[PDB]
Amino acid sequence: LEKDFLPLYFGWFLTKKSSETLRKAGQVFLEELGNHKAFKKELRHFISGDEKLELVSYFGKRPPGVLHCTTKFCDYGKAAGAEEYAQQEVVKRSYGKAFKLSISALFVTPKTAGAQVVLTDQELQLWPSDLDKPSASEGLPPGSRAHVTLGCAADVQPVQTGLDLLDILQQVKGGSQGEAVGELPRGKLYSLGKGRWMLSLTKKMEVKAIFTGYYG
Secondary structure, three states, X not given: OOOOOOOOEEEEEEOHHHHHHHHHHHHHHHXXXXXXXXHHHOHHHOOOOOOOOOHHHHOOEOOOOOOEEXXXXXXXXXXXXXXXXXXXXXXXXXXXXXXXXXXXEEEEOOOEXXXXXXXXXXXXXXXXXXXXXXXXXXXXXXXXXXXEEEEEXXXXXXXXXXXXXXXXXXXXXXXXXXXXXXXXXXXXXXXXXXXXXXXXXEEEEXXXXXXXXXXX
C-alpha cells in the first residue's frame, strides 16, 4: 500500500470578498507609500538603481486569485514536521472550517509586501511548533510569523514575506520602530530603515477565511 501524501501547505484561504478587500488595501498602501516624501527620500536604501518608483510595479509578482495565510508548509510530506503537524486532532477537526483573521499592519521591504496577521488563541492551536526554528523568530511569541503575502520583487520567493515580517517585529521589539513619520488614512506610517516600512492600522481589518490544504 502507498501512503497518502499531504498538502503542499495548510493555511487559511480568504474568501473572494475578503481577498478583494485586503488586496485593494494593500494596493492603496503601495500607492500612498510611493507617493510619500519620507519614502522618496530613502529610495537609495530601497534600490541601488537610479524620477519616481511605482511600488505596484516593483512588486510585480502578486497572488493571482485569493489570498492566504499559511500555517504549515508541508511539501506533500517532505518538509520536516509535516506529518506531525497534519496528524494533530485540531488540524483534522478544523479542516474546512471558517475562521476570522485580524490584520494589524501592512508592510513593505525591498523584497516583499505583506499584511501582518494576529491570531486568536483558537487559531494559534493550528500554528505549527517545530524543532528547527528561525533565528529571527527568537524572543517573539508563537505565531508572530503569520502573514498574508501581497507582492514580491522579481527575484524573491513568497516565503521571504514571513522572514521580513519577523525582522520588522524584531526591530519593534527593540524599540527601533521610532517616531511615526507619516499619517495615512488607515494608520501611522513607520520608517524602520534598510528600506523597511510599516503601516499600523488604526482599526484592524477582519477577514473571513477557510482553513484547508493547498495541493498545487
